Ligand binder design. Sequence first.
Ligand SMILES: NC(=O)c1ccc[n+]([C@@H]2O[C@H](COP(=O)([O-])OP(=O)(O)OC[C@H]3O[C@@H](n4cnc5c(N)ncnc54)[C@H](O)[C@@H]3O)[C@@H](O)[C@H]2O)c1
Ligand SMILES: [Ca+2]
Ligand SMILES: [Mg+2]
Ligand SMILES: [Mg+2]
Length: 318
Amino acid sequence: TAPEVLRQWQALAEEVREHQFRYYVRDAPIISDAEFDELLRRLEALEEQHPELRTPDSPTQLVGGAGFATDFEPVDHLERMLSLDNAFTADELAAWAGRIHAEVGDAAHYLCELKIDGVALSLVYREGRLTRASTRGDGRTGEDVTLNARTIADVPERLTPGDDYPVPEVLEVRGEVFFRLDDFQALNASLVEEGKAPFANPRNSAAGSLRQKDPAVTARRRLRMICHGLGHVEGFRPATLHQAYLALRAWGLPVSEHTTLATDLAGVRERIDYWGEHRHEVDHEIDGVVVKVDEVALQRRLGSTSRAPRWAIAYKYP
Ligand SMILES: NC(=O)c1ccc[n+]([C@@H]2O[C@H](COP(=O)([O-])OP(=O)(O)OC[C@H]3O[C@@H](n4cnc5c(N)ncnc54)[C@H](O)[C@@H]3O)[C@@H](O)[C@H]2O)c1
Ligand SMILES: [Ca+2]
Ligand SMILES: [Mg+2]
Ligand SMILES: [Mg+2]
C-alpha cells in the first residue's frame, strides 16, 4: 500500500534523525551503535524496495549531523568532510574490492588503518600555524572548536618544516579525537564520584569533552588525536596517502603507527583478520578497519558520493 509504505518510511526516517540528533548534537545516544546501524539499514532497504521513497535529504544520502543547529559558531570546511560506507561481512568487503578493481584495476594498493571510535576533527594550518579546528557538522559546515583543539597535547600549534617537506601554504587535515580506554574509565569514575552522569562509551566521552563551550573543560581532559585524511591543501601534492603520512609525521602531526599497506584484497583480508584477533590490545576503542585506495590519482578517479568516498570502506567488527 503506497499510503502504508510512506508512513512506514516517515516513522523510520524520523527515528533515524532523532538518534542522529542525540548522537551528533548531544553526544548522548539512547540506543547502541549496532541498533542504530540496523535502523539505518532498514531505512535503506525500504528505499531500495520502493524507489518512490528515494528523497534527496533522506538520512541514507546525507552526512550524519546534517540538518541540525547547534550552540557553537558555524564554520565552513575548505573541502567536504565525509562519512564512510560500511562493510559488515566478507561479501560486502569483496563487493567493494571488486568494484575498485573493476574501475582502476590491479594498480590500486590498499592502506589498512584502524578505525578509531572517536569524534571527527578538522584542522586548518595556514603557513604552518593552526588557525581553525572544527567538527564535521553536516559535512560542509562544522562547529568551531579551535580553542578546545589547541588544548590537545597531540595537536601542535605550528608545523615543523622539513627539508623534504616544506610547510604547505594551506593544510586542512582530518583526524580522530579520542581517549585512551583507561583515561575514558577514569573520567567516568571521576564524573560518577561528583554525582554527574558518566558518558555512554569512549566515543561520546571524547565528543562531549571536545564540544565544550568552555575550553578549560577540554584542557583538563587527556584527549588524544590521530590524523587520518586530507581536506584542502595548497602547496603540497602527495601522490599517495602513505607519502602524505610521511609529510604529516615530518610536520609533527600525530599519525597512527598501526597502519599497513596491502597490495591486494588478500593482503587486506589478512590485516582485517589480524585486528579481529588483536584489537583488544590497542589502548583505545576500535570499531573496525578502514581500507583506502592509496594512490591519490585513483581516489580522484573513483570519486565520492554525497556522503562518503568511493575509494574507502570501513570494515566493521561484530
Ligand atoms: N547510537 C546512536 O544512536 C547513533 C546515532 C548515529 C550514529 N551512530 C554511529 O555513528 C557512526 C556512523 O556515523 P559516521 O558518519 O560518524 O560514520 P563512521 O564513524 O562509521 O565512519 C566515518 C568516520 O570514521 C572516522 N574514522 C575513524 N578512524 C578513521 C580512519 N582511520 N580513517 C578515516 N576515518 C576514520 C572519521 O571521523 C569518519 O567521520 C556509526 O558507528 C553509528 O553506529 C550512533
Ligand atoms: Ca549517522
Ligand atoms: Mg523517541
Ligand atoms: Mg565513528
